[PDB]
Amino acid sequence: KKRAETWVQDETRSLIMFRRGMDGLFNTSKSNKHLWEQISSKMREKGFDRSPTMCTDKWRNLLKEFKKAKHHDRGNGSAKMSYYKE
Numbered sequence: 001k002k003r004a005e006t007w008v009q010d011e012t013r014s015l016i017m018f019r020r021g022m023d024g025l026f027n028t029s030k031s032n033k034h035l036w037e038q039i040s041s042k043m044r045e046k047g048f049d050r051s052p053t054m055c056t057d058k059w060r061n062l063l064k065e066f067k068k069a070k071h072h073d074r075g076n077g078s079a080k081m082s083y084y085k086e
Contacts, residue, residue, distance in 0.1 A: 011048045015055050
């Protein structure tokens with residue numbers, strides 16, 4: 001479906017998780033800047049060298065795709081289009 005050849009499953013998974021658990025901090029605490037930096041530092045410790053800004057932008061994208069992506073509720077619709085004068 002998608003291919004950016006930038007982030008690997010390993011890194012992605014690690015980031016997502018960290019963002020999933022810390023997510024709360026973002027809900028309870030207004031400021032996030034501090035949360036972003038924290039996540040990064042943690043990642044580096046694991047063995048993944050990734051800047052804080054990278055994770056931030058990468059996340060936002062994961063949300064846009066996560067939503068658009070299929071969902072439990074039924075209702076896929078007609079993806080394909082009608083061929084003019086088929």
